[PDB]
Design an enzyme around this catalytic site. Structure first.
Site, short mmCIF file in Angstrom:
data_model
loop_
_atom_site.label_atom_id
_atom_site.label_comp_id
_atom_site.label_asym_id
_atom_site.label_seq_id
_atom_site.Cartn_x
_atom_site.Cartn_y
_atom_site.Cartn_z
N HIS A 1 0.35 -1.02 -0.06
CA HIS A 1 0.10 -0.43 -0.35
C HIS A 1 1.02 1.58 -0.36
O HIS A 1 0.58 2.39 -0.54
CB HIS A 1 -0.87 0.20 0.94
CG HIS A 1 -0.50 0.00 2.32
ND1 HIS A 1 -0.31 -1.26 3.06
CD2 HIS A 1 0.11 0.56 3.75
CE1 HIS A 1 -0.17 -1.61 4.20
NE2 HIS A 1 0.50 -0.33 4.39
N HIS B 1 5.22 11.40 5.58
CA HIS B 1 5.15 10.24 7.60
C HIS B 1 6.62 10.06 7.60
O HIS B 1 6.71 9.22 7.25
CB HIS B 1 3.88 10.05 7.10
CG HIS B 1 2.67 10.09 7.58
ND1 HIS B 1 1.21 9.97 6.66
CD2 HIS B 1 2.49 11.57 7.78
CE1 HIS B 1 0.60 10.29 6.71
NE2 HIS B 1 0.79 12.19 6.65
N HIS C 1 7.79 7.57 5.12
CA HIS C 1 6.27 6.41 3.71
C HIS C 1 5.90 7.98 3.10
O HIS C 1 5.67 8.92 3.81
CB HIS C 1 5.50 6.00 4.38
CG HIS C 1 4.42 5.85 5.55
ND1 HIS C 1 4.76 6.21 6.50
CD2 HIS C 1 3.26 6.27 5.49
CE1 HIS C 1 3.67 6.20 7.50
NE2 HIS C 1 2.84 6.53 6.15
N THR D 1 -3.17 6.32 9.93
CA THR D 1 -4.43 6.47 8.92
C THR D 1 -4.94 4.98 8.14
O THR D 1 -5.27 5.73 6.89
CB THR D 1 -4.36 7.60 7.97
OG1 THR D 1 -3.07 7.73 7.28
CG2 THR D 1 -4.12 9.65 9.20
N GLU E 1 -3.22 12.88 3.27
CA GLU E 1 -4.46 12.96 4.06
C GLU E 1 -4.78 14.16 4.83
O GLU E 1 -6.05 14.36 4.32
CB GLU E 1 -3.22 12.21 4.85
CG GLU E 1 -3.44 10.36 3.85
CD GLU E 1 -3.66 9.81 4.50
OE1 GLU E 1 -2.35 8.80 5.77
OE2 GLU E 1 -3.96 8.60 4.53
N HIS F 1 2.01 9.06 0.59
CA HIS F 1 1.05 9.09 0.43
C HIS F 1 0.77 9.64 -0.27
O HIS F 1 0.93 11.15 -0.65
CB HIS F 1 -0.45 9.47 1.66
CG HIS F 1 -0.26 8.49 2.67
ND1 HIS F 1 -1.13 6.80 3.18
CD2 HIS F 1 0.37 8.68 4.06
CE1 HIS F 1 -0.62 6.52 4.32
NE2 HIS F 1 0.13 7.73 4.67
C1 LIG Z 1 2.33 3.37 11.57
C2 LIG Z 1 1.88 1.73 10.94
N1 LIG Z 1 1.15 0.98 11.45
C3 LIG Z 1 0.62 0.30 10.27
C4 LIG Z 1 1.29 0.59 9.35
N2 LIG Z 1 0.52 0.02 7.49
O1 LIG Z 1 -0.15 -1.04 8.08
O2 LIG Z 1 1.37 0.99 6.88
N3 LIG Z 1 1.24 1.73 9.43
C5 LIG Z 1 2.09 2.92 8.68
C6 LIG Z 1 0.56 3.93 8.04
N4 LIG Z 1 0.17 4.48 9.64
S1 LIG Z 1 0.95 5.98 9.30
N5 LIG Z 1 -0.23 6.75 7.91
O3 LIG Z 1 -0.48 6.27 9.84
O4 LIG Z 1 1.74 6.50 9.62
ZN LIG Z 2 1.66 7.74 6.41
#
Ligand SMILES: Cc1ncc([N+](=O)[O-])n1CCNS(N)(=O)=O
Ligand SMILES: [Zn+2]
Length: 257
Positions: free
Chosen positions: A61, A116, A91, A195, A103, A93
């Site tokens: 993703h 992020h 990473h 998120t 986001e 988005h």
């Molecule tokens: C920190 C974390 N735990 C699970 C995931 N994931 O499934 O990608 N992430 C990364 C994306 N999450 S975020 N946008 O809230 O930083």
């Molecule tokens: Zn993120």
């Protein structure tokens, strides 16, 4: 499983992750006129000089650039935070078009992408334990707009060919995350959540006011990645962003006037 398609996207997440309709979900729209300047907010402290990147991974993703977080080498402190938070990964988005992808939004404005940098509170020992705490994570969000290229992002862009599909990873050492930061550290901050599923409400969000500019070529490369695994029908990795959620009982604070 969850994703960003019509049948497993954000509107479907609540079925497997009921906290999706929780009291402090992210992202949110940042209404700049309603956010309140908070003079008691200390300056943000970003210490990435000793950061140790290790690898870059396409997880289906997004792509994560992972860091060695077994010691305080890259940490975020100050600002609205109490304690020390270690960088574990960063990473992005992004969208299928420059007019969307971020986001968080600013006065409803969507940016082409959002970076992020994820950090976890060292008082909790490890990331897995931190996400189960209301103040377990601190995520630094940085908006990306399309214009001039971001020199410091090119090494990331150039390695994407090697992790085109889900599950692929590549060595990615000696990458300096300081090269992705804008000049100003002015920010907005509010309590929120991850998120992406599990959508845990363990994040103190720190979103920088100043976006960084990346070139159309750089963001175009992001859009060539695949959500699918190798040997599967190609589904371009684009629009992997969750839309703004209800602010509910929260106030966004600004570190600047
Ligand atoms: C920190 C974390 N735990 C699970 C995931 N994931 O499934 O990608 N992430 C990364 C994306 N999450 S975020 N946008 O809230 O930083
Ligand atoms: Zn993120």
């Amino acid at each position: 499983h969850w994703g960003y398609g019509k049948h497993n996207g954000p509107e479907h997440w609540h079925k497997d992750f009921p906290i999706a309709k929780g009291e402090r979900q992210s992202p949110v729209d940042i209404d700049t006129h309603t956010a309140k300047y908070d003079p008691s907010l200390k300056p943000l402290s970003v210490s990435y000089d000793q950061a140790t990147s290790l690898r870059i991974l396409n997880n289906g993703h997004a792509f994560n650039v992972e860091f060695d977080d077994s010691q305080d080498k890259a940490v975020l402190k100050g600002g609205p935070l109490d304690g020390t938070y270690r960088l574990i990964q960063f990473h992005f988005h992004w969208g299928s078009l420059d007019g969307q992808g971020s986001e968080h939004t600013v006065d409803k404005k969507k940016y082409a992408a959002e970076l992020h940098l994820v950090h976890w509170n060292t008082k909790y020992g490890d990331f897995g334990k931190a996400v189960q705490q209301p103040d377990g994570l601190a995520v630094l969000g940085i908006f990306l707009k399309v214009g001039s290229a971001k020199p410091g992002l090119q090494k990331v862009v150039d390695v994407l060919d090697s992790i085109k599909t889900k599950g692929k990873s590549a060595d990615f050492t000696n990458f300096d995350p300081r090269g992705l930061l804008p000049e100003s550290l002015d920010y907005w901050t509010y309590p929120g959540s991850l998120t992406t599923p599990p959508l845990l409400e363990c994040v103190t969000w720190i979103v920088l006011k100043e976006p960084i500019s990346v070139s159309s070529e750089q963001v175009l490369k992001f859009r060539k990645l695949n959500f699918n695994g190798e040997g599967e029908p190609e589904e371009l990795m684009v629009d992997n962003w969750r839309p703004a959620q209800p602010l509910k009982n929260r106030q966004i604070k600004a570190s600047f006037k």
